[PDB]
Amino acid sequence: DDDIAALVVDNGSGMCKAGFAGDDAPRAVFPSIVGRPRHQGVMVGMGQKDSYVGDEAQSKRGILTLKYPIEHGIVTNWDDMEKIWHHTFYNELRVAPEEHPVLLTEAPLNPKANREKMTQIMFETFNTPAMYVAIQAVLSLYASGRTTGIVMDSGDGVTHTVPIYEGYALPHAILRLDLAGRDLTDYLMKILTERGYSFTTTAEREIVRDIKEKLCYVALDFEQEMATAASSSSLEKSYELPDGQVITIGNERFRCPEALFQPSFLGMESCGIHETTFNSIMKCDVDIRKDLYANTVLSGGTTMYPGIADRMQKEITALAPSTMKIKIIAPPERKYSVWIGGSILASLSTFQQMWISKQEYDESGPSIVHRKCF
Amino acid sequence: ARLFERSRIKALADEREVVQKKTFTKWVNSHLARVSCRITDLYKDLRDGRMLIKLLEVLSGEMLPKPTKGKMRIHCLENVDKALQFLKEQRVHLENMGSHDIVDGNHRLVLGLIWTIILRFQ
Amino acid sequence: MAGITTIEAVKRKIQVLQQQADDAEERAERLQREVEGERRAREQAEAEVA
Amino acid sequence: ITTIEAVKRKIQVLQQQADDAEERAERLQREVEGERRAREQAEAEVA
């Protein structure tokens, strides 16, 4: 067999995806939730389960207190991280972790102790022979198939942009806006209070998230859509709660993702995603802006709202000089793009040198990742 | 099933899963050859929980507490929890593993349990 | 009604009971044909839209 | 071993068969509604 397939694990704030190197799709996709029972057991002899990891916690929502180990792209709780990683390796994949290399992804700007802790955990506990850590929005270009473009990756944790020109990435033009999908979920919870529907518990935030994923879209023109919503009731939808109640979403459908383009709704003074992309363009040099305007790439699940590509194209066309043409490239499989390009990274023949060996970790501590990765 | 091939994700996962289930069935049948038992279907036969206890008795080399006698769901949960408690006492790290997961018959959890008992008793 | 017979009322109830069982049988076959047709139509539409 | 016990057994069997029949019928009806609910949007998207 000689060379063995190296598995890739994409960890984000929302979902964890995992799969082998050569596959076109991930093996397994599941939410990154850890659940614990709030009530006390009353019947003798069901069986003991201290914690619920993954889809089992999502099945028994109304009995647990759900918890997220990743906050804004930073691992807040580590024992939960061994819980999800053990459930990934030994349950979803059924593979021995000590006989494969592991590829992992992370945000561009983050504390270095995060990288050191993932390296130490992958080497000391799981006995992985080799590992690598990569930036997500770099892998989006591998998934796209071009070596020149700007990536805006918007996940559940962060929204970061990076430009790459002909394989050279400019580190001073990288911007990391902290707006993401969980803030939009909280804003949707706040604006559903206006109609009278109250959603409070952690088990009910998943219901709010599903409502967000199903009946939301980005308006092309915000004030005109406000006028249309105030005029008639054509743009109203009805959602079915798990217990049989029916709610009427109405106006709010295009008021949740509009906070992406105007962060003053959430109290933040930061610029929107389109102005962040434009500012990341203008932080680069003169000669490469023409190529970067023609290769804007969307990535991440948060950019799956309908009509977001047209809105971004219109806003950037308004900001940019009129003599150039702007095309937003939004593939229909952007949600797994961070995974897909990563798989391509594990199939190249020249990538076998870049792996962090076990001997290098043994002789240099966990700080070797600051020299070997990126 | 049209919904099975609807998405490229789970169809591929079950393509691996069927072969893994065949391999695990052959592996458990060899260790259950000595005792008068056979695993016709991996999901249906382990729902009772007695047969997994017999597997543990063959593999470990020491006797296990005898199962309780009953026909209801509580007895099956009791039998599964006995084997899970014995595995926990053997310092085999099992997480996200509950008796009701085995009794309900989740595919991934049963396969993970068999893979873990293969790896840790080898 | 002052004049009634227990046998006759029981007999009418048996009549209604067999009518219920038969009705539920046409209901079942009815709905099985319906679901098969809808599944096939959805599959064909999905293939051609893809 | 007589006809009356056979009558009682026959009507009891018929009754429980009928009950199982409406249970299966109503479950199938709700599944049918869901499938049609899904298919109609696909036709509109084709247009």
């Binding site: 050569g22 076109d24 998934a143 198939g145 229909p332 897909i340 391509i344 199939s347 | 490229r8 | - | 998207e45």
Partner: peptide, 22 residues
């Protein structure tokens, strides 16, 4: 499976019911 496909840009995991609005 990547090594067979020329373009992962034009790739489908599901119909996705895109472009439903208007």
């Amino acid at each position: 499976a990547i090594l067979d496909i020329e373009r992962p840009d034009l790739m489908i995991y599901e119909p996705h019911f895109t472009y439903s609005l208007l």
